[PDB]
Design a protein around this ligand. Structure first.
Ligand SMILES: *C(=O)[C@@H](NC(=O)[C@H](NN1CCNC1=O)c1ccccc1)[C@@H]1N[C@@H](C(=O)O)C(C)(C)S1
Ligand SMILES: *C(=O)[C@@H](NC(=O)[C@H](NN1CCNC1=O)c1ccccc1)[C@@H]1N[C@@H](C(=O)O)C(C)(C)S1
Lengths: 453, 453
């Protein structure tokens, strides 16, 4: 087998690597280094989720976002409640919700007499994975994959810190977001600056307090925040859009937390599963993975889905297809949780299942292609012949974690499936910029070995 | 050396072990297995914190909680604000705070004309380490090591779950706690019960939303919770206490972040560093570990202390003594963070420094003793000769991690220092207490072999 142990000498000291690879044509394992050790899969976990969604939702699955009413339209009045049903669509934009509500106008409604009622009942318990880290939860990459999701549950604010030391940074939030950012951040001199922390503290109802300080900035300083209360935000968006559509509403916003019945007035459909999967796999969209992860459980078990149910469903579905998980911990669909534990060989058996059932699943074309698209279009170790346009691979990255899982063609034309997990990769301070040169070398060498073996 | 490899076969499949041990007398490494791999040290991290505290704070160090004012007493009146100074004392009781406020009365203050002002400026930024897990923040083990800390920053509620399936559990907050618990928990029948989560969501001003279910319990019981907003909690307690004391107060609560200059009116001192350290090391008190961690930074750098500053301070101080960290990540003092990355051989070097410098530091007596005290009084693998009353060791535990770091005497009366890091331990999932039997066996055999070598 490949001596992976020599190859890891290029990785920073203290890191650990799990590598396993199989020549599918020969059915030979050609690299096996820590192949049974549990490690953190990061976003390569999405491979499990792609397969469970294909099997249990199918290619016609679309998320639905719907308007319903318990009462009747007469004389331009909806005489009853506007029920807006959200089921986790991770790709719903503000524009798409606006056009959906517009459909009320076409049906002649110019006034709602009752209350606005959100049904978000398809998802339950928290909208975040267990073992997620607390202090990223305000960042856009980590937005909550909740039943109600508008513009990725993320908004942008601008901090004007182009001012002298001692001045208060100016916070600018575009008027379209119904949230509030407040607080007193100050500009610090070159002496104080290295000691600054720019913090945000989350308060009820989507109020954000920025505190702390930063160095004078010489461009505008973006802050890209995750919406924290997704029902309240969606309800406030809906009210402003009704107003702008000219539909009169003066009732309350109700969040009853169980399914709501009424007559279907209008349904917006997301793009279908193969489109969602392509985007989740090429670009590694976290919210699409955790949305699908719970949609899978909702549909499989026919009950409100928590992350716990999503875990149970994905395992049971894959186990029926012959995958064995032993004591693996899959706490989420995106792999963000620091509690996930999976051995390279388990990921590998799903990758072989993927290659073997390609005529039914069509998941091959979803993998990023080296030097061509997705998250490895510019991946340093992979961008030269004979790897470029050959390796395709799902990536995963967290602080300290750099993983690949995918396929390639070797020098004899045979297909190789492989899994690379690297954990404990550290090249400086907790806050400083990670150096990828040791990663680039290691990956260039390993995939070259796999090519030539 | 000892064949640790053979020993790690009794550990559960997928787990990963890092083990290193040095015969101090012979200056010889006698076990070296993944000794250079970064792993999660859990609460063995507190060894680093103990040493930094000894060195930079010293045996005379005590946390001060203080009352000051800028007004003068006159007619039983305090003609200005009462400033209450909190500096992170992790061992402050509600009784102690009361006795401190009593001093206001011994001095004849009848009422305070002004506002209540809390000075917490010695700590800075968040009171939670980076890379701590969000869903545990409500547990008492994980209560915030904030500046203001009263009775471990922990409370309980009374629950009554002796009801039938479908019925609501009764949750009453005891009168002494200024906290709300809201929402509701139902009793689950024997079916649901296996897969029940009790969810707790934090809202502003120490309001806790509880949701989900519990299994029927015949008898009433208490659940502990971490206080979340510690400033508010503290201030609510101070105001109850001033009433109970008969000191009239009708002003505002103010929470500036800059230190508050004023005339000292009274003060209370915690127990001094050696008692703090012994309780930390013996009982593995996370709050003492994280307060000391930032108290180290505050005194070392003479400026307000974030966890990032604590990291800098602890490394700098141990570096001065010869310890080399390379690219380790020490994100907190308690070892709770999932971002911590330390190799066994680094922890081993600090243990060698501890034993070498015992005459000055007196840390050996802080370690739990096998079969005797602290967290290893009943540790399974250590409770028979020749290990009982011999092995001393700081433990560390998280989901998936079972570590030991400390010393023992071998058959020749030589001292052996050792580090045992086990990660990726899983014999079950996120919803199952894993069996500790393979760990008992591993440890028994490992320490027996280090005994006889
Ligand atoms: C999956 O690996 C996923 N990674 C992240 O989202 C990762 N996020 N973190 C780290 C801790 N909390 C987070 O939200 C991350 C890593 C680096 C930069 C931003 C975010 C996605 N997969 C990655 C990949 O394919 O390599 C990314 C494209 C970076 S995001
Ligand atoms: C150090 O290891 C520390 N461990 C814990 O506090 C640990 N806390 N966790 C686990 C997940 N999030 C947390 O806050 C824990 C583990 C098991 C049971 C309770 C708490 C302290 N040291 C441990 C030890 O010395 O073994 C404990 C005595 C359990 S607490």
């Amino acid at each position: 087998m490949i001596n992976v142990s020599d190859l890891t000498q290029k990785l920073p000291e203290g890191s650990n690597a799990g590598v396993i690879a199989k020549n599918i044509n020969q059915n030979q394992i050609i690299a096996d280094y820590n192949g049974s050790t549990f490690m953190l899969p990061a976003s390569t976990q999405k491979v499990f989720t792609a397969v469970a969604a294909k099997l249990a939702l199918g290619d016609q699955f679309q998320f639905e976002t719907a308007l319903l009413s318990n009462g009747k339209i007469q004389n331009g009045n909806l005489d009853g409640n506007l029920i807006v049903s959200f089921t986790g669509d991770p790709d719903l934009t503000r524009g798409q919700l606006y056009s959906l509500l517009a459909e009320l106008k076409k049906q002649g409604i110019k006034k709602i007499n009752g209350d606005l009622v959100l049904d978000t009942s398809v998802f339950s318990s928290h909208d975040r994975g267990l073992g997620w880290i607390w202090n990223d939860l305000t960042m856009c990459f980590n937005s909550p994959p909740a039943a109600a999701n508008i513009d990725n549950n993320c908004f942008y604010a601008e901090l004007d810190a182009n001012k002298n030391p001692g001045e208060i940074v100016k916070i600018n939030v575009p008027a379209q977001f119904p949230i509030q950012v407040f607080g007193q951040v100050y500009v610090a001199d070159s002496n104080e600056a290295p000691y600054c922390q720019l913090d945000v503290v989350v308060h009820d109802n989507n109020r954000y307090q920025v505190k702390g300080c930063l160095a004078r900035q010489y461009k505008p300083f973006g802050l890209s925040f995750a919406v924290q209360n997704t029902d309240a935000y969606a309800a406030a968006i809906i009210q402003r859009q009704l107003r702008k559509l000219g539909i009169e509403f003066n009732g309350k916003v109700l969040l009853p937390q169980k399914p709501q019945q009424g007559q279907l007035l209008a349904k917006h459909l997301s793009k279908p599963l193969p489109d969602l999967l392509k985007k989740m796999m090429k670009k590694s969209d976290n919210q699409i993975a955790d949305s699908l992860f719970r949609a899978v459980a909702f549909n499989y078990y026919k009950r409100p889905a928590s992350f716990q149910l999503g875990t149970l469903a994905v395992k049971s579905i894959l186990q029926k297809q012959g995958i064995r998980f032993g004591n693996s911990i899959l706490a989420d669909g995106s792999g963000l949780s620091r509690h996930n534990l999976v051995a390279p060989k388990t990921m590998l058996s799903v990758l072989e299942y993927i290659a073997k059932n390609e005529d039914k699943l069509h998941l091959m074309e979803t993998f990023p292609i080296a030097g061509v698209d997705g998250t490895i279009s510019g991946r340093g170790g992979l961008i030269s012949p004979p790897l470029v346009k050959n390796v395709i691979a799902k990536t995963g990255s967290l602080k300290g974690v750099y993983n690949l899982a995918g396929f390639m063609t070797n020098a004899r034309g045979e297909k190789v499936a492989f899994v690379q997990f690297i954990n404990g990769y550290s090249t400086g301070d907790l806050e400083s910029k990670t150096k990828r040169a040791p990663l680039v070398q290691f990956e260039r060498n390993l995939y070259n070995e796999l090519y030539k073996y």
